[PDB]
Amino acid sequence: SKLEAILSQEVEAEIQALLQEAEAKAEAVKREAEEKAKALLQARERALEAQYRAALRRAESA
Amino acid sequence: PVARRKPEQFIQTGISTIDVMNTLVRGQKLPIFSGSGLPANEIAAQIARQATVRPDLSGEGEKEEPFAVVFAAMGITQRELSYFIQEFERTGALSRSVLFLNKADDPTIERILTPRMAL
């Protein structure tokens, strides 16, 4: 019957909202990582080069 | 008396705190109160080598400033004496410096004059 149909009618749109929330919750996890990984590695590239050149320079000073 | 002029120019040190709280400038006599068994000594030749005479930031260059590092110890122990050889000698950091240093072992008489030299 139709009564319980309204109970149906309520659930289906909620199934979709769990998903929409979820979708955003996977993506964000993904995106938090994207910037973070990229941003440290830059710094560690940077740092390693300087920690080299200045030595070689100081070596040139020898 | 008519030669001297009141300070007007910072100089960087390679140390932070000792430029922030108390800020290095040229023609400044900064006493550095040490105590007994301490690595004062270290932080000397340490921040020594770090040093580079600088006022770039003010709007000047740094090309026409010769950097003269003059180093003088006294009363040096076997141990310490090599730390010296370690810093200058590390690379060519004697590339801008001279040592002078009357050991305890050495006469205390010659000692006296020691500074007066580099002075």
Curated annotation (Swiss-Prot), chain A:
UniProt entry keywords in alphabetical sequence: ATP synthesis, Hydrogen ion transport, Ion transport, Transport
SS bond list: none
GO cellular component assignments: proton-transporting two-sector ATPase complex, catalytic domain
Residue ranges of coiled coil: none
GO MF assignments: ATP binding; proton-transporting ATP synthase activity, rotational mechanism; proton-transporting ATPase activity, rotational mechanism
Role of this protein: Produces ATP from ADP in the presence of a proton gradient across the membrane.
Family indicated by similarity: Belongs to the V-ATPase E subunit family.
Protein name: V-type ATP synthase subunit E
Gene name in the database record: atpE
Residues of the full protein shown: 2 to 63 of 188
Swiss-Prot record, chain B:
Family per similarity comment: Belongs to the ATPase alpha/beta chains family.
Name assigned to this protein: V-type ATP synthase beta chain
Organism: Thermus thermophilus (strain ATCC 27634 / DSM 579 / HB8)
The protein's role, per its UniProt record: Produces ATP from ADP in the presence of a proton gradient across the membrane. The V-type beta chain is a regulatory subunit.
Transmembrane portions of the chain: none
Positions spanned in the full protein: 121 to 239 of 478
Domain of life according to the entry: Bacteria
